[PDB]
């Protein structure tokens, strides 16, 4: 057997894999930055890795446009010429492959971020609807804020063993919430306090609010903040350009309607059309527009 | 008898009900957030509830387009099979109906915010005039900034009995204005000091100024500011996109005029037209424009 | 004799009166806010009051379009039935007329801000040129920032005799620059330190930077800052909308050129035009473009 | 011999001189602000000054358009009646000419900033490609942010020997990073700490984040910040106006495609086309578009 790329199954499967790419893009950077020194986030990662492997089996059993191609030999050779290498590197079980330090095993699973390429391959499906691309733009924005929160925590944390003597953002967080770092390294804020503050700071830098209770203080935090300001400005010229243009695309029926209504009303005022005739003109435009848009 | 939906009474009544929906959108969230534990606002809420009940009787005695339907049975069944459920729920006298704690009696009146649906139903009347839709957009911005100020006060206040040990924004307000909270729970800022500071903080986060004397410090305050940064950026792509478009629509006569003027001016440069002829061309453009628009 | 409204004298006089309106819009708010309790600014104000009086005499001797009307009686009655009242109220010298406290005598000169109406009447002269309207938009922004600096200092100063007990922005300025107010009310920042700080805070609020060393702290300063954030957002939808649109209008030759060049380039790529013919097409486009625009 | 201005050598040379102008725009303002009183930045400046002299010899031996002109006498007189004066002043070795204080000798090398004119002459070469004009816009922004960081350090540094008594931004930097100044007016932050903080402050002001741990405190720092807020708002109305327009210009193939797809989709909904015909319509649109754009 072989699966048609326009079938109602393969359409729903491509929309389901988007949610497992969004899951990967959230929980992989978080586990790589915050959690490194059954669990639901161990077994759900195993379930999700099995589905990203089943998607390789579906890619060996899908038709594709050259006219459609429907022979398993002409399907398999096209997947090997195309994306199979990137898809297999995104599927190696590195957690089972080596036992080789635990820091390397924790970091190396960031190779799963190659699963973001399974969205770039399929924008011809996902971008078709205005309400779907507006959701992808807000998830692109919230994921870029989350990835920068994981980098901002990695920067804030790596300056404690290469010790600063109480300058970097984690010491200031400890004081501001009344959970200070003791000189033994004991105490300090929880992973919720550190994550929520890092996400708050990077939405505050990207959306340009800059609240000034978290503020960058060491040179690596300042050089990171210059990079977040260069990313945030290119992104506001692009994402919140396209969200405004997509709202204007949905609103385009109303914008055209009021433009043609204003022309009809201005014509009616310029000629001072008598009421017995004017009502026939301004009712006809509403009828004709309601039929043909 | 029956009322025609285009009549000058029903037109003025639908513009009066916009001002009473704006009153409900202001003083209901304020009473639910700041005033929990006759007065002028206790009698004015009774007068306004009577007018929102009179508006239900008008909705049983108004015509609608199938042209118009003008039989009370065909009117009433259309209202029951439409908006009557929301309209009557938005008029239940919960201030009298139960005796059942006084906090819940005060909170349950927030069901009156269903009166905002009486504006969404009538955007065919309200959006027609450029100065009226520009007014609505500035009131949607000011009402969202006010509703967020009521949530920001509810968050800042509920963390005092869920005691924080002096971390949340109301303790910082007490120390900043020289009206501290005593350790006995006495003193602290007045309702004007707390409301004006809450409204100042939500305009500061929405317009992205971020003044840094009020800043979010506990995790619920930081999670709220992440939500206000997402609301504020979607609202700047939408409201201050549409306000700039309506400003350009009011400017459209001037924009067309200068665009046609530049074509005529460049034509007169390109052919180097002699003055006696140039004045005839360039005066004719001003007549033909100021006559025909 | 009588003066033609299109003459080179009346063109230069209308462009000179713009500079004396810009002078009035600067030095009247400043003298009313900062300098209350002959000099160079007193004699320049007298010279400028004489020129705004001479402009009333020119308005009694200028032609106007009904063809142009040139009889002095038909000119004078048209000016009296028009702007003469506002032009005379903007010219009555209340300072020289009076013989009742000197605070009111200094404040009453703010009637000179009616001279801003002598710009709004003449936008058909001033808005014609792209470099002139871009200058008017930047001076409208810099004058709105200056008028708000004068209101912000009037608020900050009135709360010292209506005493705050050391809360408002002037006490914090004293501590920050090392010029504290003494306990007797003696000393404190100079008029330069106070003005440059008030102008800095209002550019910081309007452009939304919010630097957080000056921040609003009493309720009148917070209510003013809410007003500046509503002014600043409507103004960024309008002024920095129109400045960007005028920059696009100045760029419109280059924008049309690249749009037609991209069409000709895309056509040449699609048909794979051989080089001997490619150069002829691609040069002819540049000749036809640079000749006719 | 003589060089044709469209040849692949002269194309590569004009793209190489853009990189040496970008190097000049970085390392000359930096050396003039931070380093006042062979190694890499002595020998690389010698190599680059020799290449800007070799470019003068190329400018005497290149063809130009009046139709092309190729006689060395008609080339040389066109360069002498054109840019040769600016190109010679941008190449005088003032460091070898004078032997009178060394502060002026170091500052006088800022004459090399006339090399920015060698980019402004050649925008007809560089602006042709959409990726190249987007790169020039981001480097124009990052170079304005760098030049303002050199002025901001010159202001912050000159008020230490013209002593402030502990007010300006460099004293605050020393206290924040754990490197306080000695009472002699000496020691404290390194050139990395001072440069990275100055560049962080000008991106913070230009992108309007305003982080509030660096803030202007003396009057020269406040007057500078008012100028940066006027430059930053004109620049965001112009540079990030153009970057968002260039992103929409690159996206114009997709924007035209989806607008034409939506017109076809709306037509197919309006007539309710049966599936055996509908597929042929929407498949033909995809063929016709992917063939001709």
Q: Which of A257, A162, A274 is nearest to A218 (CA)?
A: A162
Question: How far is the C-alpha of A33 from the C-alpha of C65, rounded, in Å?
Answer: 75
Contact present, A80 and A59 (Cβ < 8 Å) = no
Alpha helices in B159-271 (DSSP H): 169-176, 191-206, 219-250, 252-270
Q: Give the number of other Cβ atoms within 10 Å of residue A171's Cβ.
A: 19
Distance CA C159, CA A232 (A): 40
Of C200, C176, C201, residue with least CA distance to D165: C176
Select from D192, D258, D266 the Cβ nearest to the Cβ of A293. D266
Substitution target from C176, C191, C201, C211 for chain D, most D beta carbons within 10 A = C211
Cβ of B219 within 8 Å of Cβ of A196? The answer is yes
Choosing among C210, C213, C215, which should be mutated to test the A contact, i.e. which has the most A CBs within 10 A?
Answer: C210
Would you state the structure tokens that stand for residue D41, as one six-digit string? 């930045």
What 3-state class would DSSP assign to B69?
strand
Residue C53: partners with Cβ closer than 8 Å, 6 or more residues away: C91
In order of A135, A169, D175, the CA distances from A217 in angstroms are 35, 7, 11
Tally Cβ neighbours within 10 Å of residue A10: 17
- Give Cβ neighbours of residue D176 (< 8 Å, ≥ 6 apart): A217, D213
Architecture of the domain defined by C149-236: Orthogonal Bundle (1.10)
> Which chain B residue's Cα is nearest to C291?
B270
Q: Which of A214, A218, A215, A224 is nearest to A167 (CA)?
A: A218
Burial class from Cβ neighbours inside 10 Å (0-12, 13-18, 19+) for residue C72 reads exposed
Q: What is the DSSP string of D146-201?
A: HHHHHHHHHHHHHTTTTT-SS-SHHHHHHHHTT-PEETTTEE-S-HHHHHHHHHHH
| Phi–psi pair at D181, nearest 5 degrees | -65, 145
The Cα D244–Cα A240 span in angstroms is: 10
* CA dist A168 → A145, A147, A217 (Å): 20, 20, 6
- Cα separation, B14 vs B6, whole angstroms: 10
Candidates C204, C238, C249, partner chain D, best to mutate (most D CBs within 10 A) = C204
CA A22/CA A43 separation, integer angstroms = 17
Judge: A216–D200 Cβ closer than 8 Å, yes or no.
yes
CATH match of B129-250 with 2.60.120.10: no
Rounded distance between C-alpha atoms, residue A13 and residue A8, angstroms = 9
Contacting residues for C126 by C-beta, under 8 A, at least 6 apart: C14, C18, C119, C132, C133, C136
Tokens of B120: 């969404």
Element (H, E) at C86: helix C84-89
CB C225 within 8 A of CB D219: no
**Residue (of B118, B157, D160, D161) closest to D172 by Cα position:** D160
Across the strands, what pairs with D181? Answer: D187
Tokens of B201: 């903080």
SS3 readout for D6-47:
CCHHHHHHHHHHHHHHHHHHHHHHHHHHHCCCCCHHHHHHHH
Q: Kindly list the residues from chain B whose CB atom is less than 8 angstroms away from the CB atom of residue A248.
A: 241, 245
Listed residue (D209, D66, D227) closest to D155, CA to CA = D227
D179: nearest CA in chain A? A167
Classify residue A33 as exposed, middle or buried by CB count within 10 Å of its CB (0-12, 13-18, 19+).
buried
Six-digit token string for D118: 């060698």
SS3 at position A65: strand
Residue ranges in C168-216 assigned as alpha helix (H): 169-176, 191-206
> Are the beta carbons of A142 and B229 closer than 8 angstroms?
no
Query: Facing residues of C65 across strands?
Result: C68
Q: Tally Cβ neighbours within 10 Å of residue B104.
A: 11
Beta bridge partners of residue B62, listed in sequence order: B3
Chains that touch B (3 or more CB pairs under 8 A): A, C, D
Is residue A58 within 8 A of residue A3, CB to CB? The reply is: yes
What CA–CA distance (Å, rounded) separates B78 from A73?
62
**Length reported for chain A:** 293
- Pick from B109, B114, B111: nearest CA to B95: B109
Q: Are C226 and B207 in contact (CB under 8 A)?
A: no
Q: How many contacts, defined by CB atoms under 8 Å, are there between C and D?
A: 70
Q: What's the longest Cα–Cα distance across chain B?
A: 90
Hey, is the C-beta of A208 within 8 angstroms of any chain C C-beta?
Answer: yes
Question: What span, in angstroms and rounded, lies between the C-alpha atoms of C64 and C79?
Answer: 10
Residue of chain A minimizing CA distance to B244 = A244
Q: Does D223 touch chain C (CB under 8 A)?
A: yes
Alpha carbons A172 and A57: distance in angstroms, whole number: 51
Query: Is the CB of C168 inside 8 Å of chain B's CB atoms?
Result: no
Residues near A30 by beta carbon (within 8 Å), at least 6 away in sequence: A146, A150, A195
**Helix/strand/coil (H/E/C) assignment for every residue in C123-136:** HHHHCCCHHHHHHH
For residues D214 and D205, what is the distance between their CA atoms, to the nearest angstrom? 10
The token duo for A274 is 């008598």
C-alpha to C-alpha distance for A282 and A268, rounded to whole angstroms: 9
The experimental method is cryo-EM
Rounded distance, CA C290 to CA C284, Å? 10
Q: Coil, strand or helix: which one is D70?
A: coil
CA distances from C257 to A9, C246, C286 (A): 48, 18, 9
Distance from C-alpha of A157 to C-alpha of A169, rounded to nearest angstrom? 9
Q: In chain B, after which residues is the C-to-N distance over 2.5 Å, breaking the chain?
A: 37, 66, 99
Q: Distances from the Cα of C111 to the Cαs of C25, C114, C116, C147, in angstroms?
A: 11, 6, 11, 14
* CA C220/CA C222 separation, integer angstroms: 5
Q: What is the dihedral of CA D73, D79, D85, D88, to 10 degrees?
A: -80
- Pairs across A and C, CB distance < 8 A: 3
| Strand A68-69 with A64-65, pairing | antiparallel
Pick the closest to residue C251 from A78, B34, D133 (CA basis): D133
- Note the residue count of chain B: 293
C93 touches chain A (CB under 8 A): no
Helix (H) or strand (E) holding D227: helix D219-236
Helix (H) or strand (E) holding C5: none
Burial of C25 (0-12, 13-18, 19+ CB in 10 A): buried
What would the CATH number be for the domain defined by D128-244?
1.10.287.70
What is the number of CB-based contacts under 8 A between chain A and chain D? Answer: 70
Whether the CB-CB separation of D86 and D117 falls below 8 Å is answered with yes
Please name which of C73, B217, D74 lies closest in space to residue A213, comparing C-alpha atoms.
B217
By the 10 Å C-beta count (0-12 exposed, 13-18 middle, 19+ buried), D122 is classed as middle
Inter-chain touch C196–D236, beta carbons under 8 Å: no
Contacts of C257 (CB under 8 A, 6+ apart): C289
Q: Is D202 on the interface with A (CB under 8 A)?
A: no
In a 13 Å sphere around the CA of D110, the CA atoms on its Cβ side amount to 16
- Cβ distance D219 to C193 less than 8 Å, yes or no, reads yes
Two structure tokens written together for B80: 């029951």
At B181 the three-state DSSP class reads strand
- Rounded-to-integer distance, Cα C134 and Cα C24, Å: 20
Q: Which chains touch C (3 or more CB pairs under 8 A)?
A: A, B, D
Q: Are B285 and B264 in contact (CB under 8 A)?
A: yes
- How far from A155 is each of A179, A197, A217, B25, B244, CA to CA, in Å? 20, 14, 12, 45, 40
Q: Nearest to residue B239, comparing CAs of B131, B147, B139? A: B139
Q: By C-alpha distance, which of B47, B128, B116 is closest to B83?
A: B116
> What residues contact A164, with CB distance under 8 A and at least 6 apart?
A171, A218
Cα distance between residue C226 and residue D182, in whole Å:
43
The answer to whether A134 faces chain D, any CB pair under 8 Å, is no
C266 touches D: beta carbon within 8 Å = yes
Tokens of C70: 């040139």
Q: Which of D113, D107, D154, D125 is closest to D62 using CA atoms?
A: D125
β-strand pairing of C68-69 with A68-69: unpaired
Three-state secondary structure call for residue A179: coil
B108: buried, middle or exposed (CB in 10 Å: 19+, 13-18, 0-12)?
Answer: middle
Whose tokens are 């009206």? That residue is B179
Measured CA to CA, the distance from residue A251 to residue D163 in angstroms comes to: 60
Indicate the DSSP class of residue C180. Answer: P
Q: Which 3 state secondary structure label does DSSP give A276? A: helix
Round to whole Å and give the CA distance between D62 and D69: 9
* Residue given tokens 């971390």 in the structure block: B167
Report which of D208, C210, D148, D213 is spatially closest to residue A233, judged by C-alpha positions.
D208
The separation between CA A200 and the C-alpha centre of its own chain, rounded to angstroms, equals: 17
CATH 1.10.287.70 matches A129-247: yes
Q: How far apart are CA A274 and CA B155, in angstroms?
A: 60
* Residue B262 CA from chain centroid, whole number: 40
Tokens of D265: 């989709």
Helix intervals (H) in chain A: 8-33, 40-59, 72-81, 84-89, 94-97, 102-108, 117-120, 123-126, 130-158, 169-176, 191-206, 219-236, 239-250, 252-270, 275-292
Q: Are B126 and B136 in contact (CB under 8 A)?
A: yes
Please tell me what resolution, in angstroms, this structure has.
3.5
* DSSP states of D73-116: HHHHHHHHTTTHHHHHHTT--HHHH----HHHHHHHGGGGGGGG
Q: Which of C:239-258 have CB within 8 Å of D?
A: 240, 243-244, 247-248, 258
Q: What number of other Cβ atoms are within 10 A of residue A227's Cβ?
A: 14
Q: Write the residue in D205, D217, D293 that is nearest to C176 by C-beta.
A: D217
Q: What CA–CA distance (Å, rounded) separates D169 from C104?
A: 42
A272 phi and psi angles, rounded to 5 deg:
50, 50
State the Cα torsion B100-B106-B109-B113 to the nearest 10°.
-140
User: Token pair of B198, please?
Assistant: 């809450």
Among residues B148, B139, B138, B134, the alpha carbon closest in space to that of B206 is found at B148
Per the structure block, which two tokens stand in for D54? Answer: 């070799």
- What does the alpha-carbon distance between residue C199 and residue D223 come to, in Å, rounded to a whole number? 9
């Amino acid at each position: 057997w072989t699966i048609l790329h326009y079938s109602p199954f393969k359409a729903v499967w491509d929309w389901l894999i988007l949610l497992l790419v969004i899951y990967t893009a959230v929980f992989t950077p978080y586990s790589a930055a915050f959690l490194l020194k059954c669990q639901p986030l161990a077994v759900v990662d195993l379930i999700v890795d099995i589905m990203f492997i089943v998607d390789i089996l579906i890619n060996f059993r899908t038709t594709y446009v050259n006219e459609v191609v429907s022979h398993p030999g002409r399907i398999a050779v096209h997947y090997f010429k195309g994306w199979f290498l990137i898809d297999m590197v995104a599927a190696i079980p590195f957690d089972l492959l080596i036992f080789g330090s635990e820091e390397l095993i924790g970091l190396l699973k960031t190779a799963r971020l190659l699963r973001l390429v399974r969205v770039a391959r399929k924008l011809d499906r996902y971008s078709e609807y205005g309400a779907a691309v507006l959701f992808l733009l807000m998830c692109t924005f919230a994921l870029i804020a989350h990835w920068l929160a994981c980098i901002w925590y990695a920067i804030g944390n790596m300056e404690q063993p290469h010790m600063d003597s109480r300058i970097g953002w984690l010491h200031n967080l400890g004081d501001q919430i009344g959970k200070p770092y003791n000189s033994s390294g004991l105490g300090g804020p929880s992973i919720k306090d550190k994550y929520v503050t890092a996400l708050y700071f990077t939405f505050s830098s990207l959306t340009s609010v800059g609240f000034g209770n978290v503020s960058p203080n060491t040179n690596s935090e300042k050089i990171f903040s210059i990079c977040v300001m260069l990313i945030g400005s290119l992104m506001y010229a692009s994402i919140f350009g396209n969200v405004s243009a997509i709202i204007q695309r949905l609103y385009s029926g109303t914008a055209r309607y009021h433009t043609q209504m204003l022309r009809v009303r201005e014509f009616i005022r310029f000629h001072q059309i008598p009421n017995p005739l004017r009502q026939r003109l301004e009712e006809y435009f509403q009828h004709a527009w309601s039929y043909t848009n």
